[PDB]
């Protein structure tokens, strides 16, 4: 690197006009292949989580969220080292794109988004809600560790992850649960869906969810 591309924004600027898997060089100069959203909100986004059809188990242990899981063809989670590697110098706006089972689109936009290395538990450190029709359902979670069903760092007696069946920056427990189960719309189970509270509440699992970052 030094010669190559360092962000999706960079690849947009080089005239990569369609979304897809391209290879950016991280700050450590290691190469990572990522999904570039070249479209939404003027494009240039590096997509780090994607749900879209129910095909992948997001109910995953710590190691599995450390490395990343899923498929390039479908849903995935880029992995918590990669995510940290991504947002750990400079600063990255965060966007969250949601789409329901009727194609009513919603988003939410934050001015900075960054996350701790494994040691500091991949602690979330989020800036300021900018806008978006889904409302703020991410600030609540600011300054929290990341947990999973086999690694509890939550401020609730029990296991937020085990009870709401996800992986997240879980306090007591959440307002957002984008890694929860794919429950395809209305659900009677309580909050263990792909949920964004201000978005569509604790009983409705979105059809698409995307979380992405561009350099501000
Ligand atoms: C990046 C990609 O291919 N996925 C798209 C993306 O442009 C967008 O985030 C979302 C609505 O914004 O719809 C997704 O399916
Ligand atoms: Ca706990």
From Swiss-Prot:
A carbohydrate binds at residues 144-145. The fibrinogen-like domain (FBG) contains calcium-binding sites that may be involved in carbohydrate binding. The keyword Signal applies. Homotrimer. Interacts with elastin. Interacts with MASP1 and MASP2. Interacts with CR1. This is Ficolin-2. Belongs to the ficolin lectin family. Keywords: Calcium, Collagen, Complement activation lectin pathway, Disulfide bond, Glycoprotein, Hydroxylation, Immunity, Innate immunity, Lectin, Metal-binding, Repeat, Secreted, Signal. It is found in: Secreted. One of its GO terms (biological process) is complement activation, lectin pathway. The chain holds residues 98 to 313 of 313 of the full protein. Expressed by the liver and secreted in plasma. One of its GO terms (cellular component) is external side of plasma membrane. Glycans are attached at residues 143, 203. Its main location: secreted. May function in innate immunity through activation of the lectin complement pathway. Calcium-dependent and GlcNAc-binding lectin. Enhances phagocytosis of S.typhimurium by neutrophils, suggesting an opsonic effect via the collagen region. It comes from the Eukaryota. Residues 1-216 form the Fibrinogen C-terminal domain. Ca(2+) binds at residues 152, 154, 156, 158. Disulfide bonds join 1-29, 8-36, 160-173. GO terms for molecular function: antigen binding; calcium-dependent protein binding; carbohydrate derivative binding; mannan binding; metal ion binding; proteoglycan binding; signaling receptor binding. The keyword Metal-binding applies. It comes from Homo sapiens (Human).
């Amino acid at each position: 690197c030094l010669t190559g591309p360092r962000t999706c924004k960079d690849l947009l600027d080089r005239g990569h006009f369609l979304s897809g898997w391209h290879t950016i060089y991280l700050p450590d100069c290691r190469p990572l292949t990522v999904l570039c959203d070249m479209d939404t909100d003027g494009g240039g986004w590096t997509v780090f989580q994607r749900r879209v059809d129910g095909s992948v188990d997001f109910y995953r242990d710590w190691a599995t969220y450390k490395q990343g899981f899923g498929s390039r063809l479908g849903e995935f989670w880029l992995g918590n080292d990669n995510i940290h590697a991504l947002t750990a110098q400079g600063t990255s706006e965060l966007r969250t794109d949601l789409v329901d089972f009727e194609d009513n689109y919603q988003f939410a936009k934050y001015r900075s988004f960054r996350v701790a290395d494994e040691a500091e538990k991949y602690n979330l450190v989020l800036g300021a809600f900018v806008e978006g029709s889904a409302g703020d359902s991410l600030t609540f979670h600011n300054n929290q560790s990341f947990s999973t069903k086999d690694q509890d760092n939550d401020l609730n007696t029990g296991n937020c992850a085990v009870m709401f069946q996800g992986a997240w920056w879980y306090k007591n427990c959440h307002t957002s649960n984008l890694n929860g189960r794919y429950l395809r719309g209305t659900h009677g189970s309580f909050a263990n869906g792909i949920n964004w509270k201000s978005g569509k509440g604790y009983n409705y699992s979105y059809k698409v969810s995307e979380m992405k970052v561009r350099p501000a």
